[PDB]
Design a protein around this nucleic acid. Sequence first.
DNA 1: CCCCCCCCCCC
DNA 2: CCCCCCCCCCC
DNA 3: CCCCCCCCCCC
DNA 4: CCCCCCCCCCC
DNA 5: CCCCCCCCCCC
Lengths: 598, 150, 598, 148
Amino acid sequence: SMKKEFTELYDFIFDPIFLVRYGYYDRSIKNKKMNTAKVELDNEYGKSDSFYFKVFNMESFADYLRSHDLKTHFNGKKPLSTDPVYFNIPKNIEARRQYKMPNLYSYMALNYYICDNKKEFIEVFIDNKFSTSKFFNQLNFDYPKTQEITQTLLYGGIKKLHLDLSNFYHTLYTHSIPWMIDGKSASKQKKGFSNTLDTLITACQYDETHGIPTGNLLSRIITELYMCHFDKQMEYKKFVYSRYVDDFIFPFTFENEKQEFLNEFNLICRENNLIINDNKTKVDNFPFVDKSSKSDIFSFFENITSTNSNDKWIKEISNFIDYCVNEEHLGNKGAIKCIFPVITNTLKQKKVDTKNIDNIFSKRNMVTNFNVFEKILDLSLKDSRLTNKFLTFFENINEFGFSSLSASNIVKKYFSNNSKGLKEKIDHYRKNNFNQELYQILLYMVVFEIDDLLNQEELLNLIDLNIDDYSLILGTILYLKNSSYKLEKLLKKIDQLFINTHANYDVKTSRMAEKLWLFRYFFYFLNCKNIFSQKEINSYCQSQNYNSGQNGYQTELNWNYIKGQGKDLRANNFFNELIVKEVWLISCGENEDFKYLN
Amino acid sequence: SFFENITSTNSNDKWIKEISNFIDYCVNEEHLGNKGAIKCIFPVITNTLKQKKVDTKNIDNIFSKRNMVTNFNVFEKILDLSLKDSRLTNKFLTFFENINEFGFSSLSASNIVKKYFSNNSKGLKEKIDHYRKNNFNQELYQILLYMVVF
Amino acid sequence: SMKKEFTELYDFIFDPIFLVRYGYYDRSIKNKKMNTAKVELDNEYGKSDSFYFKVFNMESFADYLRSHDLKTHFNGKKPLSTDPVYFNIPKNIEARRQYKMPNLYSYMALNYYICDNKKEFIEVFIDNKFSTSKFFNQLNFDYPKTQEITQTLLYGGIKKLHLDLSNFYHTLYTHSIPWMIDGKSASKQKKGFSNTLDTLITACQYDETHGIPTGNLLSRIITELYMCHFDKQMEYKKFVYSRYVDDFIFPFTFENEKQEFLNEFNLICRENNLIINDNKTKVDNFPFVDKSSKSDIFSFFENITSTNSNDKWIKEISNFIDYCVNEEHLGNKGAIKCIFPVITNTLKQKKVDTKNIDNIFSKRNMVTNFNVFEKILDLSLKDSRLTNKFLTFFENINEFGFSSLSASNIVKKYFSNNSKGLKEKIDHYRKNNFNQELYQILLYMVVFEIDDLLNQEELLNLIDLNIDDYSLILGTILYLKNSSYKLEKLLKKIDQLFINTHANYDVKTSRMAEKLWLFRYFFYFLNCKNIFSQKEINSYCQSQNYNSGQNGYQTELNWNYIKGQGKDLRANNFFNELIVKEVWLISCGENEDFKYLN
Amino acid sequence: QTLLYGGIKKLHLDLSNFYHTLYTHSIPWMIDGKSASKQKKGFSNTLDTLITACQYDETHGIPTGNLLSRIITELYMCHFDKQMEYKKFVYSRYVDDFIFPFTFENEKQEFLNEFNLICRENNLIINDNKTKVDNFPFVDKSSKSDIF
DNA sequence: CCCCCCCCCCC
DNA sequence: CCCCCCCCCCC
DNA sequence: CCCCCCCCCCC
DNA sequence: CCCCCCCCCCC
DNA sequence: CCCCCCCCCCC
């Protein structure tokens, strides 16, 4: 039954371990058996578009949860307020979009509350008919199935009205969530489900009521609940439409239907402080335009075989990249995303031999200096949202036989040829807080062993304020990967950053409820396993004249002393429990020395 | 040449999705100014089904299958396409005649059209009233002819 | 000196009595001597665009303040939370804009706090150089002077960049006010000036942190402080521009200047959760376009004299209206606003005799049935933001000699000819909460003695939920103006409304901290002076079987019983102090019988 | 494609009527420096003399339609390229079709100023109609895959 | 995971 | 035509 | 020339 | 207010 | 109809 498929999917999804192991970084899996009871390191079952799993993942945390219960940390009535990792990404070539990756403690508080009240979500989701977003790309509810549902919903209509909400996630008033769930006139008399949910959301973003912490699956689930209650209001008024998150497709024939729909939709938006993006409002008349047909794209390679020469494969792949970039320019949404999966699947399906793949992607044409890996790398650097897809593509063809040393040399050569523009780019994103672009550049330098772009001085200039946690981690990794440099300068930079960050806070505020919680955990976890040698930390702190004590040297660099400071130590106790059990949140590679090339 | 790389060895699900994408593609072609593209949908689907040499029971499965999760059926999509333009009534009924000869059961088609009409009864009654007041003869004719036939 | 003119203006403005007498309804006066120490009723010195002064004004309250001190009501640390009057107005022919007229108690709390900390505002305003909005159209800082300042600020630039903030007032995060004033990294540790200011603002909108309560002068002053601190940040980075509220005019010559400005402006907007309206972004190249020249408009009437016939005056005025409507269509902002003042000033300056004015505006052409007052009335009904300008124009020409009975008959005839469309309009705005349009129609019916449009049944359908206070007052006035109808049905409607409104609240919430505070004050003030006869209220409440008691009949209609209910009675005590002293907030006319035709 | 790496935007520039209005005495300017035209007998001066002899001592334009003209024009344009490379710019040129890859508007403006300066020095005129910036995702209208 | 056909939307 | 203000729309 | 894959840009 | 020239921007 | 390749335009 339809109901029973929905129920299976939602009992899979609404599990705390699922919700952190794939939810935190917004990962999707296509089969329940992918959710193995072991730590996954060498492969990736998941599909994600934000963060590189081989460096940043929740596998160790999920393994910890699988055997030990952290319910006890999450019984205090008032949820602890914490600062998230602010991580700004491109919306397009011009605009920006803000992610907020919550403190893991606040994430887990919200996570257990949502799984404890999962029926609040599941009854509405299963009763809902208009949402194609209430599957969250999980299991087998992929893009063609959601388009099938949308097509069914658009029956009978000679016209389509398209409506969008402007800046929906990022300006959503969080106290309007209980209005949508329970009725606005019942907000005026807490202790209910929706009020507590709002409180935990604001705790995830430091009691900020402006917007929802975007970039994770719990936020998507809460937003979907909000929007399915919007859908319930519109359905009680007897309207039929398709919604993907905030993209409303209204089928209609007569203008009175359209006008009555617009009045009702305007009314609910005004009641809940929602704003329509009037730029995106458009009526499409039949015959309907469809710019997102992907048939030509996935059938680019029909007439090429493994009997074709490696040169024809190279030129065909190059033409493919140009063709999909042009398709995306023309309005074919997701065409650039399609380049990497379909190249990989064509290489697998045409059954090209490993040594032929090595020749295809490692060949440098002598006259033209052209190499097709370099073209694909430059394409990925054109949009930092493509970082994960590019690195997954590299992983796949490296498995297919493309040598990792050859890839490292190609990326090194690319970076040397473009070093000046790349340094100007790094400076641009550092001044303007373009977090994902800087992250992409540093992650490529970490992955492909680029040690020539930035010297010691620029690397230490990376460790400063207005740098996101992930970039701080990647720069610190770049610095530790170079054995020539000595650790005192990094210790000084990190200490300065920690003190300056704590200076923005009440002196009774715990460190792990503050900004840079993830970098701090990285540091304390490294120090706990002597990559950050305890002797040289002692030397640095002697140089700084810190007073010793019962726990140690009374510095921001000493977790033994830090874990006990602050009035509320709940986040500190949670992260100390993680540190003692050797739960890592940042993967240091197979051999603990920060190499990700396999 | 939409259907060059599909064969009778392809699964019925791929045939369903390929036909759906075909309909969307020709509707977009007609929107872009390709005159007669929507007319082309029915003859070339029928000729592809004949030429790919798909078996009668496979045709029955292709056009009678209701996907349980999505409630999608490809005959219902083609029927709704035909109701989008009443000049398509004859082409739709000829297409139904052809695939019914190809093996698609007439009782299954009747149930599919009945279900479509029940789900859209309110809008269809408003449509009937519209064409009755405004003398839209072919639209009313198409609706009543579907009710007679199915 | 420049400083000393600024100082004079700001010591005039930052006075509590000024800030309520002209600030509450956003009124401007051109001379300090207009701020008389008496109640103004028959004339209006002020200039306002929102609410009709002859019905809604603060003159009685200001007279009360002038002799008695209400500081004592405003010493409790935690400000009482209240609901404002929600009053939605057209933004244009399509979009809407929300006003929130605060509870007078919360207004006065904010008012005294701001005047007590006026130096916080005045130092920044006087030090500011980029704002042409920091004069609030007061005294002699009118439109040409602000344009003079803007012109000076735009010197040296071959290009202008225009930037706007989208939905600035209505989506402003109120906790970002202390960020702008003090620095965002100092929000994390209250008791300071900016935090208390934020708290009083949210108290004005029922502890809602989404947006600023728009439609009054205190909101404009707070928004100007916010924006002048934005200007201080941009000036420290050595940029020069003109700002009107959120309209940024950046003068520049080279594209590097423009790009650096855009990066800095984007950075501050991202820091303070401000969103640029990317639709309004445009660069203008010299030679510069100027679509707002008003020279032809104010010189339409140069070649007409009082020796011209009344027919030529009629036709000239008609052509004038068409010409300014076309000017506004072409992008001449404020051209339609210009119609009424310049017609009035032309009639005064051409020195047309009173009987000639009567003939001009009262003449009905027999063949064409055309009357120029009816055309101007229909123009005003085309945009409800024109209500005040139309009624001021009528007041002026009525003073010039145009008979009020003739105007009443003309408006009556108009309303009879268009009764069907007008009833459909009334229903439209009632279903869709178009508050200002409904207000305009009911205010015309009140002013011009229209008693034929709506019978008793529709008038009682006016008294229901989702109707703003001002429309509720105007409908109740329409009902009391008709002596044929008896008062029991209105008493039943009003009682139902009061009970239903209190049902949305905690049972310990005081009535005058709730929605419909202004309607409730209207009712209680009428009952206190026996327009709402006490005998017939007793009869109604006997019919409803209310239990009597120490104060009276224990109903929502009895202020004696109502004033003592609720845990916090501060708002009730303040409004009871107003009621006892016969301070009215709604003018009932010269002879207390609700006639405004003079 | 290799030359256009690293760029989020492309600037397209063309020279108007390049072959047919090329001042032939500007060839020694491009090859040797304009301030060295004022004191012949050198390579570039003799080359200019033979070109004008091919078109009846006409100094307006280059005799178009043969490979020697293409070689001389390519020498001229590669010296233009040497001037732009010494100022540390990277672009693709086909004859007179300049494809400038860039990311920030300051790069584009500095390139435009330098290019304008050299064009003014050598009596070269930009076809302002063909000037356009393309933003990524880039348009490509010349795919021949369906055709072949 | 298992054992042809895939691959895209949003915030 | 008579005795200021005019003057244009359509088919 | 020799022995699959080609084929187009400019002036 | 008092005693020529005015009149418009925003939210 | 018979025995590969079809299939569209208009009024």
